Amino acid sequence: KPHISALNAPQLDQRYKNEFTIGAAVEPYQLQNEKDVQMLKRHFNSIVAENVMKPISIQPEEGKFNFEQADRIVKFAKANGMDIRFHTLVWHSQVPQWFFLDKEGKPMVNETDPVKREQNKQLLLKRLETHIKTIVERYKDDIKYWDVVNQVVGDDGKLRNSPWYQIAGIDYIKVAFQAARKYGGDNIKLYMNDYNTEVEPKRTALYNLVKQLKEEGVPIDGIGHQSHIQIGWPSEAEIEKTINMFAALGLDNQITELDVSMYGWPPRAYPTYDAIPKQKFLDQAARYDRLFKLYEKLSDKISNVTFWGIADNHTWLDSRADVYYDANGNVVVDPNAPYAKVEKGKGKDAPFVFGPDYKVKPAYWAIIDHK
Ligand SMILES: O[C@@H]1[C@@H](O)[C@H](O[C@@H]2CO[C@@H](O[C@@H]3CO[C@@H](O[C@@H]4CO[C@@H](O[C@@H]5CO[C@@H](O[C@@H]6CO[C@@H](O)[C@H](O)[C@H]6O)[C@H](O)[C@H]5O)[C@H](O)[C@H]4O)[C@H](O)[C@H]3O)[C@H](O)[C@H]2O)OC[C@H]1O
Ligand SMILES: [Cl-]
Ligand SMILES: [Cl-]
Ligand SMILES: [Zn+2]
Ligand SMILES: [Zn+2]
Ligand SMILES: [Zn+2]
Ligand SMILES: [Zn+2]
Ligand SMILES: [Zn+2]
Ligand SMILES: [Zn+2]
């Protein structure tokens, strides 16, 4: 099956249009790249901002809201009939430092006095409510799907002990959802998003958290499974079990940030795209085959599958593509083998179904067919 230009390959979204939307994460510069634009128009019917809707991009100083970049994505989506997801109202990263300062400018996490700690909690929660309000009041009629909180459960299966949690305890999560619902109404859909959702003890900790929140009347419509995965991990069976366990709580499931890295963890990357052996693309294609068969099997539980980029020329996974060199300067990709140095974030991953030259990969063929 040939490596043809994607720009006129059969449309991915159309393949899946009765099963779930097909989405891409974008940067605003990509809406000014002719190829990226034609890719979005051709293959995708949902869109999300990779970065420009995060807390630090939207409100970098208190009272200073930049919606200009966010607005461009929204405008594009509307003109092209795409669904929109908002990523994300609350996170422990890419979040402005000002939220967590007390009235004297000291970090709130330092405060020892209990009455002052409680005052800081209430102040933080007010600021959270104001951030959410201002965003949802602007976008509630345009944006259907909302990542209300991102990564709030730890890999150890405890709540992530971020400043949100250290300052305000569990109530930051409830307040975020209640605020979104209050200002956005009943027709926006609210998600908790996280990675390694298939993995214990994180998975059951997420499940117990959400079950309790819903029992307490916190409005949560779904779970976002970030799905930053590898060729051989996590298994499809464990993916299935995960999706099924949340759908049994009455939750929608979205595959929100899918990419299938060529590498393991921590990754030992190739230094360039050209160095990645052909067999890796085949192994990837077979993984994508199995994965999409599974998502189809579960399509009544999955409303969207979004890729965390458009094509292999641009992926956040390059920032993790560490390149290991042996004493003779040769590249090392065997996870156990000797090496002398590492160049962090200097290599190349290849996670999508579309190549860096915008031509279709074997993974594309594997998911566009009906086998
Ligand atoms: O073998 C397993 C092993 O596999 C297992 O799991 C590891 C556990 O850790 C996982 O790592 C996670 C993956 O999820 C990450 O967060 C997601 C993804 O990234 C976010 O978007 C990116 C945010 O950063 C952006 O770059 C910014 C842009 O602006 C600049 O000004 C700024 O300076 C720059 O840094 C980038 O563009 C953007 O795409 C997304 O919002 C977020 O929600 C998380 O950070 C990371 O820790 C790993 O995936 C697993 O393999 O552990 C157990 C073993 O058994
Ligand atoms: Cl990126
Ligand atoms: Cl290529
Ligand atoms: Zn379309
Ligand atoms: Zn090259
Ligand atoms: Zn569906
Ligand atoms: Zn990017
Ligand atoms: Zn090519
Ligand atoms: Zn297939």
- Which amino acid is residue 235, in one-letter code? S
- CB of 50 closer than 6 A to ligand 1? yes
**Considering its fold, how many domains does the chain have in total?**
1
Question: Experimental method for this entry?
Answer: X-ray
Nearest Cα to Cα of residue 229 among 274, 295, 173: 295
Whether the CB of 29 sits within 6 Å of ligand 1: no
Q: Per residue in 232-250, is it b (16+ CB within 10 Å) or e — as a string?
A: eebeeeebbebbebbbeee
Could you count the other beta carbons within 10 Å of the beta carbon of residue 227? Answer: 24
Q: Resolution, rounded to a tenth of an Å? A: 1.8
Ligand (nearest to CA of 288):
9
Q: Which atom of ligand 1 is nearest to the CA of 147?
A: 43
Specify whether the CB–CB gap between 60 and 96 falls below 8 A.
yes
Distance, CA 358 to ligand 5 centroid (Å)? 14
Structure-derived torsion over alpha carbons of residues 23, 25, 28, 34, reported in degrees to the nearest 10: -60
Place of tokens 């956005």: 184
Task: Output Rg (C-alpha) for the chain, integer angstroms.
Answer: 21
The closest alpha carbon to 243, from 222, 259, 220, 261, belongs to: 222
* Cα dist from 209 to 154, 274, 333, whole Å: 12, 44, 39
Residue 350 CA, ligand 6 centroid: distance in Å:
27
Residue nearest to atom 36 of ligand 1 (CA): 316
Nearest CA to ligand 1 atom 19: 316
Nearest of 68, 76, 61 to residue 30 by alpha carbon:
76
Angle separating helix axes 202-215 and 236-247, nearest 10 degrees: 10
CB 30 within 8 A of CB 48: no
Cα(166)–Cα(28) distance, rounded to whole angstroms?
A: 34
The answer to whether 10 and 42 are in contact (CB under 8 A) is no
Supply the range of the domain harboring residue 128. Answer: 1-371
**Residue 312 and residue 352 in contact, taking contact as beta carbons nearer than 8 Å:** yes
Report how far ligand 4's centroid is from the alpha carbon of 46 (Å): 9
Would you say 54 and 91 are in contact if contact means Cβ atoms under 8 Å apart? Answer: yes
How many angstroms separate the alpha carbon of residue 225 from the centre of ligand 6? 15
Give the separation between CA 127 and CA 133, rounded to whole angstroms.
Answer: 10
CATH assignment of the domain containing 198? 3.20.20.80
Decide whether any atom of ligand 1 lies within 6 Å of the 265 Cβ: yes
Which of 150, 208, 219, 223 has its CA nearest to residue 182?
219
Q: Are 196 and 155 in contact (CB under 8 A)?
A: yes
